[PDB]
Design a protein around this nucleic acid. Structure first.
Ligand code: M4A
Ligand code: M4A
Lengths: 276, 276
DNA sequence: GACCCTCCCCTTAGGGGAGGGTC
DNA sequence: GACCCTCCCCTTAGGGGAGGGTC
């Protein structure tokens, strides 16, 4: 009243950066009442300070500045609706996070399983919770020529639903007394889901289906072309010896141990199978 | 296996932009296995595709890329903890929104009151819910020289707690048969709070206190220097006529109607007072 | 001494464009 | 024809810096 405010003065009492203000001047969001054409100084009336209440608030909810310009104009009738807009926008940014917390929280649950694990190369027998998965016909792939490009479509579907990618790759094959590895080929190959959001439009060549709750003879180890077969052998034997009775395929699960493109690639296999 | 992937090829099956990949090459986050020194083409092995699982996932939770570099290196023991990091980070980005939804939702509740309001210039008598506020000693300000710079400290406190600014300015003064306006000066001046988050460190010269639930003779109108006094008059009269009995100060509340720096400034006053 | 000014280079994570050179 | 390349200008909302000119 009866004098102007310098930008310092405004900044201080309005709690807003000098550089901030200058920018708002620049974009024609908030201009000083008067610019000294001699010194180019910016001066501000007490009246206009009120405009900042909005600019501040709108900022704190993080609406864009170009958006604020369209905002300040409209009067209350509409300003309400606008807020109601933000309100919904929030509730969704909020539904999105609430998803993540769950996803991460489960993804974690699954790494712990990997780490805290009885012992390698031996055949543990244990009780497992069910695991939801997306499957597909193997169309004659084997461990010899399987290839993670082979997973692309499943991945496209998972990532659209989970936003995470599967951090394990699976296949299944019939339990036989296999005498070689070239003897074996996969039946239907698969990857775990984490989310219950619909797969947007599932084609009839994926299959949503599960690895069921039940008793599993399973062996787990780090990968090497050689050990792969030999550990499988341990398994076949373990059953035959104990005269156990299988009721599924063998489920095989490849998991990376690090994603560093610098250390030499290292994978952890798990091969499970259901028995009574 | 036994051939490379072109960037197109990778992009398609990994569902990631060609431009995206090129960038990851540029930052040394994800390099092609091999660059043709003749054509500068980028070629990729099937092996390395696995690195994208992380890069993709990490992206979807929106960790920075420079941060991803530090991530891929560490092995599971730590990768867990890292996630546990994100987990907490989310829960807070989430506590922040959950605040907003509430804040906006109440801020809205209060605009509706403004709009849906019985009638202007007349004296309505009504029942009011309590309103929490921050007060301060008026130190001799009147409607004549009051000035919204006068509000700066309260605002600094509110904005630190609510993140919104008060979109109304208040004062109180003693109920007298005032014969002029120069006769009047404010007692303790104030602004509404919306949040229950502590004011970080409140100085002993603010006061958290309320406008209490109770019966209010109140009049509301658009502002003009002139009407201000005259509407107040209506009020004093209304009481005196009905022989009512006041139990508070008059509470006065200035609210902007638009924040457009283009339309001429327009404010809505409300003056309330408590009676039995 | 304290305050304000106008350039000017920078920070994410790429998208959209030329304009060649190869599939 | 289809695919890939390397510059190059751009998008938020300013912060941090010169290097003058005024308080
Ligand atoms: C990515 C991947 C997935 C498999 N299931 C696999 C099996 C045997 C050997 C190499 C393999 N690679
Ligand atoms: C910002 C503001 C706040 C008030 N309470 C007020 C009172 C009378 C006249 C002008 C005023 N301006």
């Amino acid at each position: 009243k009866e004098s102007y405010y310098s930008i310092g003065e405004v900044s201080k009492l309005a709690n807003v950066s000098i550089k901030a203000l200058r920018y708002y001047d620049k974009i024609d969001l908030f201009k000083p009442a008067y610019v000294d054409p001699d010194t180019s100084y910016r001066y501000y009336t007490d009246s206009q300070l009120i405009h900042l209440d909005l600019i501040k608030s709108l900022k704190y909810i993080g609406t864009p500045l170009e958006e604020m310009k369209k905002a300040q104009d409209l009067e209350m009738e509409e300003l309400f609706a606008f807020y109601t807009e933000q309100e919904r926008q929030i509730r969704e940014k909020l539904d999105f996070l609430s998803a993540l917390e769950q996803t991460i929280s489960l993804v974690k649950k699954r790494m712990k399983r990997q780490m805290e694990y009885p012992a390698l190369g031996e055949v543990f027998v244990l009780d497992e919770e069910e695991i939801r998965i997306i499957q597909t016909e193997a169309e004659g792939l084997g461990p010899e020529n399987v290839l993670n490009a082979s997973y692309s479509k499943l991945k496209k579907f998972i990532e659209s639903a989970d936003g995470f990618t599967n951090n394990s790759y699976g296949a299944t094959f019939s339990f036989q007394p296999y005498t070689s590895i070239d003897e074996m080929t996969y039946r239907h190959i698969f990857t775990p889901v984490l989310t219950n959001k619909q797969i947007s439009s599932i084609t009839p060549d994926m299959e949503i289906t599960t690895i069921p709750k039940g008793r599993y003879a399973c062996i787990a180890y780090n990968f090497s072309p050689e050990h792969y077969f030999l550990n499988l052998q341990k398994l076949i034997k373990y059953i035959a010896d104990r005269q156990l009775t299988v009721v599924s395929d063998v489920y095989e699960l490849i998991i990376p141990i690090h994603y560093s493109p610098k250390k030499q690639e290292e994978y952890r296999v798990e091969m499970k199978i259901r028995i009574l």
